[PDB]
């Protein structure tokens, strides 16, 4: 019966909890304490990319590590050139509210989404020379938060109606759907192996989904508020997340435990974006304190502050080659660090 | 530097000038957010507006750019993401004034949106629609049967109007930082646009005073 169902659910919860308690031996701090400190890290603003009109919300890099795409709430998609500070395209938009952008690995397509409940895909390479929209995906009943590419015809979409789905571009209809998050999904990331992905849905919960199998594998719960950012460790067996509890965390997909608690007393604001570094030794995080901070994976001691903005940092990214780090905030300016 | 980067620079300069052209039109823009119920008559108000998901309607009054945003079915959103409309200068609230059962739910919705912390820099304007029936039910229907504070006789039109105005005004917490205008207008009237323009003018006047003189 339903009461028996509750009893079985509680028993399964107890089994999972007991197994997780059994798997623990020591702490990551204990394991990594004789390791040498990374040292003081001081960086400088090398290039400022001015030209936007309104607040910038997100940006994404590319495979060539030269071209980046930025988007704002005025309704413009501007593609920049990092080295020479020369604008390449300025794609005009129809809907003036967007909250995500993406760059195809091949370099022939860009995507964006917002409150229109519709995904838009643009074709950069065209004989005429004008960037034009190719497909207009529709079918969601909630606002689109984040979108990422997997192939030249496969895209992954997360929405606020507690659904995540995978589409076929030419076909224009969804292939698989993912259900199980109680709250609305906010952020997602793709594994380097391109066979699994993880996302958080504002319920202090992280779930791992499989592209081909189509059911959730594991679930992690360690926070006390909505999760705002997520990204993958370089290898592919760890992911880190940040929330409004002013605390970041690191998990393991094989051990099934949380390892470390990046925390400090002075910070009382939320986390906007989180990204790793090339060798998995830095965990940069964007705070609401009108600044950004740099942490350590195995020490969790602060290294440096990339201050220099006048408002809230909203996006963060690290180039594929491992050269530069980009920041975008509501002052309508992008800055390229080193 | 190579006869090609020069052309790239020229293309960049053309794009920059194209953006700088739109900057001026962006700067002199006034945004309005419309939130209303099903019976509020927002459809009729929008219809009479132009005779003289997220939908957008643009109009011009006295050579001033205006922008109205209509949100339907997304008012139930209660997360921080939806608070991206943090640059609007005024919020309209069309409300029915006929049915005293619906007045209650309208009051809770008003409480829901006006006390939100992000919208602490918006001049809230409240248009009481209908106001043609209420003149015909004051002498017929007694509003005392729904609320238990109205001292004045429900057949008194002015007393009922003061009752409703006080009930709406007292709903806002945190005293009052930004003003709260109100008017008793129907849908056939044509001066509502002028009323909105005058209210926005007063709001900008107050902002300019604070920014420049008193500080």
């Amino acid at each position: 019966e339903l009461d028996q169902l509750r009893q079985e659910a509680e028993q399964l919860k107890n089994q999972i909890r007991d197994a997780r308690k059994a798997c623990a031996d020591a702490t990551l701090s204990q394991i990594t304490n004789n390791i040498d400190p990374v040292g003081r890290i001081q960086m400088r603003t090398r290039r400022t990319l001015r030209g936007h009109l309104a607040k910038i919300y997100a940006m994404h890099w590319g495979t060539d590590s030269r071209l980046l795409v930025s988007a704002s709430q005025d309704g413009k998609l501007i593609i920049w050139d990092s080295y020479t500070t020369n604008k390449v395209h300025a794609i005009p938009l129809r809907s003036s509210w967007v909250m995500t952008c993406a760059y195809a690995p091949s370099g022939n397509y860009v995507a964006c989404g917002g409150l229109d409940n519709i995904c838009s895909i643009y074709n950069l390479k065209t004989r005429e020379g004008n960037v034009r929209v190719s497909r207009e995906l529709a079918g969601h009943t909630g606002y689109l938060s984040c979108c990422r590419f997997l192939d030249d015809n496969q895209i992954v979409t997360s929405s606020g109606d507690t659904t995540c789905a995978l589409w076929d571009i030419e076909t224009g209809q969804q292939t698989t759907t993912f259900t199980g998050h109680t709250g609305d999904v906010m952020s997602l990331s793709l594994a380097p192996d391109t066979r699994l992905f993880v996302s958080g849905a504002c319920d202090a919960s992280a779930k791992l989904w499989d592209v081909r199998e189509g059911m959730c594998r594991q679930t992690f719960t360690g926070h006390e508020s909505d999760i705002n950012a997520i990204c993958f460790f370089p290898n592919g067996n760890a992911f880190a997340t940040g929330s409004d509890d002013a605390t970041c965390r690191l998990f393991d997909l094989r051990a099934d435990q949380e390892l470390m608690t990046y925390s400090h007393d002075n910070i009382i604001c939320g986390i906007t974006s989180v990204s790793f570094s090339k060798s998995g030794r830095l965990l940069l995080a964007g705070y609401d304190d009108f600044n950004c901070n740099v942490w350590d994976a195995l020490k969790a001691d602060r290294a440096g502050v990339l201050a220099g903005h006048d408002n809230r940092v909203s996006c963060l990214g690290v180039t594929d080659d491992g050269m530069a780090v980009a920041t975008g905030s509501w002052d309508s300016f992008l800055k390229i660090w080193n | 530097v190579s006869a090609e980067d020069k052309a790239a620079a020229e293309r960049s300069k053309e794009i920059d000038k194209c953006l700088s052209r739109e900057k001026t039109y962006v700067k002199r823009l006034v945004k309005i957010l419309l939130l209303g119920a099903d019976n509020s008559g927002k459809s009729t108000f929008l219809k009479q507006m132009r005779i003289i998901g997220i939908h957008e309607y643009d109009f011009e009054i006295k050579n001033v750019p205006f922008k109205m945003v209509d949100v339907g079915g997304q008012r139930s959103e209660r997360k921080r993401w939806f608070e991206c409309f943090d640059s609007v200068t005024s919020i309209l609230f069309l409300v029915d004034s006929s049915d005293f059962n619906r007045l209650t739910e309208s009051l809770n919705d008003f409480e829901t949106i006006v006390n939100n912390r992000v919208f602490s820099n918006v001049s809230i304007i409240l248009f009481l629609n209908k106001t043609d029936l209420l003149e015909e039910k004051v002498q017929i229907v007694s509003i005392k049967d729904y609320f238990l504070e109205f001292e004045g006789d429900p057949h008194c039109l002015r007393d009922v109007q003061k009752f409703l105005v006080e009930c709406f005004r007292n709903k806002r917490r945190d005293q009052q930082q930004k003003p709260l205008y109100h008017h008793f207008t129907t849908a056939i009237n044509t001066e509502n646009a002028r009323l909105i323009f005058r209210d926005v003018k007063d709001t900008i006047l107050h902002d300019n005073l604070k920014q420049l003189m008193l500080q």
């Epitope: 005429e128 020379g129 004008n130 | 293309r11």
Partner: single-chain antibody
Amino acid sequence: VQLVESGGGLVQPGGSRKLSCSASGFAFSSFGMHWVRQAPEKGLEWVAYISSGSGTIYYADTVKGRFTISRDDPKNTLFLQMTSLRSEDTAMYYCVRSIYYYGSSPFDFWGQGTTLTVSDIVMTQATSSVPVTPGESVSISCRSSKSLLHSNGNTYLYWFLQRPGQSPQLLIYRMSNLASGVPDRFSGSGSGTAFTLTISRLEAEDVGVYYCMQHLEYPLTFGAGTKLEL
């Protein structure tokens, strides 16, 4: 897309004439335009170039002050004016489209052009027409004087093909990259002042005259070319 050229015909020594070019099928404002002439049975030569938005105009040193170039955006028309014609100007004219930004394909489309009759870095393209049979691989080398390796790590040399009775078509741009709608059998490489085009397994519709080009600094230079045919 289609580009048409008109305004050509028989003329007497002296006088004047205006040429016309028609564009239809693409964004005319974004693209820049060039003019290229060809002697009856000789090489090619660059004439002029107007940038996007009619910002900057460059002219050839062979003739200057007697030619005028202007564009008309709303009608998608390009026209050129000539005065004081000379016997050296007896040539059939061409129109060229080119765009400039990171990762572009300049000099992609060539118009058929028109005819007319009145009454610097140097390239060494030895002609030495090599007889060839189908299925054999060939290599053609073009020589340049000044090193074409600008410090930005970019080589600026192009290739072209012109079948008889047709217009030149782009094959390889920036010394390595292939163009759109070209067979993968075409391949090229080289180093500074060392340029070679390695074709493999020749097929039909490969007869014509090839050409090499520079784009390092104005003015532009062409070459005679070799007739790859048997």
